[PDB]
Amino acid sequence: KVFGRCELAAAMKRHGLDNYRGYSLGNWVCAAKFESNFNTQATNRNTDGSTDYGILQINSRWWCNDGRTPGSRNLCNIPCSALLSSDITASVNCAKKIVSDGNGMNAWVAWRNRCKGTDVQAWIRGCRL
């Protein structure tokens, strides 16, 4: 599924991501934009052989099991395929653990490079939330 901007804002809000660990909803929508362009089926191979999955490009190195990332962990206790669902519940639950891991949203390098410090409220502007 390819979400619209306000449609994803609503789904993230419904799943309790808005102001989770102090990150306003526009931060989460901005990260999703640059990670996946709002596409739940987005996958990208890393140089180290891990893969990033879903709307928030969660990495098999630590967070999910894809059976092909040697030496990796599965800290969200999910198959990486669950992160590709049209239902964002697994991506949200796992993103809450990532953002709680100590470096906040800096875990998403695209959030640090493209969202951090910007007018992230623009991402939810005009949305009925």
Q: How far is the CB of 4 from Na ion (least distance, A)?
A: 31
Distance CA(81)–CA(2), nearest Å, equals 16
When binding is defined by CB under 5 A, the residue of 58, 69, 90, 99 that contacts Na ion is 69
* Residue 36 sits in the site that holds Na ion (CB under 5 A): no
Closest CA to 57 of 19, 94, 8: 94
- Judge whether 9 and 123 are in contact, CB under 8 Å: yes
Q: Is 66 designated active site?
A: no
Other CB atoms closer than 10 Å to residue 115's CB: what's the count?
A: 24
Q: Is 7 designated active site?
A: no
Q: How far is the CB of 113 from Na ion (least distance, A)?
A: 24
**Residue 30 CB-density burial (10 A; 0-12 exposed, 13-18 middle, 19+ buried):** buried
Residues 6+ apart with CB under 8 A from 96: 16, 17, 20, 21
Residue 18 assigned ligand-binding role: no
- Cβ closest to Na ion, residue 30 vs residue 56: 56
* Residue 59 sits in the site that holds Na ion (CB under 5 A): no
Per annotation, catalytic residue among 7, 48, 52, 119: 52
* Residue 72 sits in the site that holds Na ion (CB under 5 A): yes
- Residue numbers annotated as active site: 35, 52
Binding site for Na ion (CB under 5 A): 60, 65, 69, 72, 74
